[PDB]
Design a protein around this ligand. Structure first.
Ligand SMILES: [Mg+2]
Ligand SMILES: [Mg+2]
Lengths: 211, 210
């Protein structure tokens, strides 16, 4: 239980940890593709990153993370709005090789998208403390000095409150849950020893991969 | 909401978090197919079951639930044995129509297996008080008096200990986490009003669909 919710400063928030609901592709329609990362996959983005080594390449997906503050079931956008508790950044770490086998087989994705620590996550910035428009926020990821992902929240197909509203249709989001909103173009592979710095609207963190 | 309890109904000192399950597992075998149901899918099977009515067919899958009592990670089969804390029955509720779609489109299964209350669960029988063989236990599910599923965990391909050993290779299992083995054949629909009675070797339980 290493991971726990906290603001940017590092102080703990009064929200449990539980699940992370994620969107398939959401950057440039057909209903949003949905999958879920378990509590086990959550981890501090500020500490070294632990990646599997015997399952094939591991890709990085920088994404905007929305922290739910109250329960949403078959919710309306007004409810979503009032409920989101903050924003931060995450890496929708995924085992591409494994996923390909899964897709071709029409099989669950948990092996490729839900393995341990497959969701490093930054601290959160309180909803009414977030300077700027979440729907128009900058997302970037650089690996060893080279920027590999750059985009803005405005390029999302399904916006933030609509997507969350849609998600609640299949799974009730309780407070403490996190929502990954998709990744921009530029998804790449991660390797032991790489140093990577993630960034979203004026905020940055730099960590490294172990092996 | 749901909380872990023993058959009698008393509360167990284990948290609730996830449910790692096998896809198909009854009859050099391809390895176990693995998906997971979130805490919000867990519900009390002694109570009337709630199913979605705007997403197509809703099927039942009777299964043997194994309650993990300690952290398992890249664990051996000995860690597994000394780690399971009990057994119970569960209904691996699934949206066949949605699952069929998901399969043909190579997309995740969450929508068809992780929806709310998609996992009715019975109380657990402490591993010590379990008089019988987990690996050779009966499972039956009756809907409105007619026999739907009638099997034995002996036909379970990936045995309970190896499977869980396997599962811990991808996601560590924590105390309170539950894993569903698999279901014999006989899987069918459940509509509102059905009277459902599920059985797991020597223990019976009945309930219905709202
Ligand atoms: Mg993604
Ligand atoms: Mg199953």
């Amino acid at each position: 239980h290493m991971y726990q919710h906290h603001n940017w400063q590092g102080a703990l928030l009064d929200y449990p940890v539980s699940k992370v609901v994620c969107v398939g592709s959401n950057y440039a329609p057909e209903e949003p593709v949905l999958f879920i990362k378990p509590e086990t996959a959550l981890c501090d983005l500020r500490q070294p990153l632990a990646i599997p080594s015997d399952f094939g390449s591991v890709h990085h997906e920088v994404e905007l993370a929305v922290l739910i503050g109250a329960t949403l079931r078959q919710a309306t956008e007004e409810h979503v709005r009032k409920a989101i508790a903050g924003y931060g950044v995450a890496l929708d770490l995924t085992l591409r090789d494994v996923q390909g086998k899964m897709k071709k087989a029409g099989q669950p994705w948990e092996k490729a998208k839900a393995f341990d620590n497959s969701c490093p996550l930054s601290g959160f910035i309180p909803a009414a403390e977030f300077t700027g428009d979440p729907q128009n926020t900058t997302l970037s990821l650089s690996v060893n000095g080279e920027q590999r992902q750059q985009g803005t929240t405005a390029d999302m197909i399904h916006k933030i409150v609509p997507l969350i509203a849609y998600m609640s249709k299949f799974f009730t989001l309780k407070a403490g849950d996190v929502v990954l909103t998709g990744t921009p173009d530029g998804v790449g592979p991660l390797q032991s020893g790489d140093e990577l710095t993630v960034t979203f609207d004026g905020h940055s963190l730099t960590t490294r991969v172990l092996g």
